[PDB]
């Protein structure tokens, strides 16, 4: 659904909404923007299949297959959707020939518990 990508926001009109805005947690904007966004679908598959974020994943996999770990990490910072499993496979396989264990463990732990277990592969 490429047409219905987007989220509407509020206006903070009444006094109780102002009091709720002043009583909100430390992560209220990013949490509600993340949970109002992509989530596990009705049949159980991942929300990976995103149209607008599709060529960024191709660029990340293309840069992690040529050995460019830092550029793939830099365009991994630009992701909004849950990235596919092939991103984590390409990133970890880029981490193998340099023996970079800490970067591979961080790559796994980023998608392990935070991103619906996409790196648990």
């Amino acid at each position: 659904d490429p047409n219905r990508v987007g989220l509407n926001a509020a206006t903070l009109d009444c006094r109780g909404r102002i009091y709720r805005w002043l009583r909100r947690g430390p992560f209220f904007q990013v949490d509600n923007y993340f949970r109002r966004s992509v989530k596990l679908n009705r049949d159980g598959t991942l929300p990976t299949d995103f149209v607008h974020e599709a060529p960024l994943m191709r660029k990340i996999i293309r840069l992690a297959h040529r050995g460019h770990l830092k550029a793939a990490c830099e365009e991994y910072r630009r992701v909004t959707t849950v990235p596919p499993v092939e991103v984590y496979r390409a990133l970890t396989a880029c981490c193998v020939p340099g023996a970079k264990l800490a970067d591979a463990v961080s790559i796994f732990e980023d998608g392990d518990s935070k991103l619906f277990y996409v790196s648990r592969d």
Partner: protein, 153 residues
């Protein structure tokens, strides 16, 4: 009663929303002002016509933001929350720590809500930096504690 009339609650809540809009807009406005008002080149990569075009484009982006908070902080930093009396920051009509007026501070002293220690009205209290150099020396000491004791990285 009861606490304060609701128009003053609306006024204090609008002041809190102005503070929140300042937190929202200050980084963006500062980056836009620091790019758009610079005459030196930004980098080796961007020079000449690219820098002037980027400055004109960020000026067009900065002017297109309806509702950007560019108001300084000291213009509406004297709002009291318990009573409707308006004080002036910098004079004796305002206290900075509990952030109320002189009238509200006197009522909370006479009510016993605060834990404050009375000292002689012509001395400098107890702070050795305040007895040493005054308000400016304690200002510089708070600066030295907050920032200048850290070796930046």
């Amino acid at each position: 009663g009861q606490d304060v009339p609701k128009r003053h609650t609306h006024f204090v809540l609008e002041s809190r929303l102005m503070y929140e809009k300042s937190f929202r807009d200050c980084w963006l406005h500062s980056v836009c002002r620091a790019i758009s008002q610079l005459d030196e080149p930004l980098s080796k990569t961007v020079v000449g016509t690219h820098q002037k075009m980027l400055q004109r484009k960020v000026t067009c982006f900065q002017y297109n933001q309806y509702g950007l908070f560019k108001t300084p902080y000291y213009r509406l930093a004297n709002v009291d929350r318990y009573h409707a009396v308006q004080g002036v920051a910098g004079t004796r009509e305002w206290v900075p720590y509990v952030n109320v007026s002189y009238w509200t501070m006197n009522k909370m002293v006479r009510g016993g809500n605060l834990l404050v220690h009375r000292v002689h009205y012509t001395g400098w209290g107890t702070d050795s930096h305040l007895k040493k150099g005054g308000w400016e020396h304690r200002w510089n000491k708070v600066l030295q504690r907050n920032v200048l004791q850290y070796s930046r990285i």
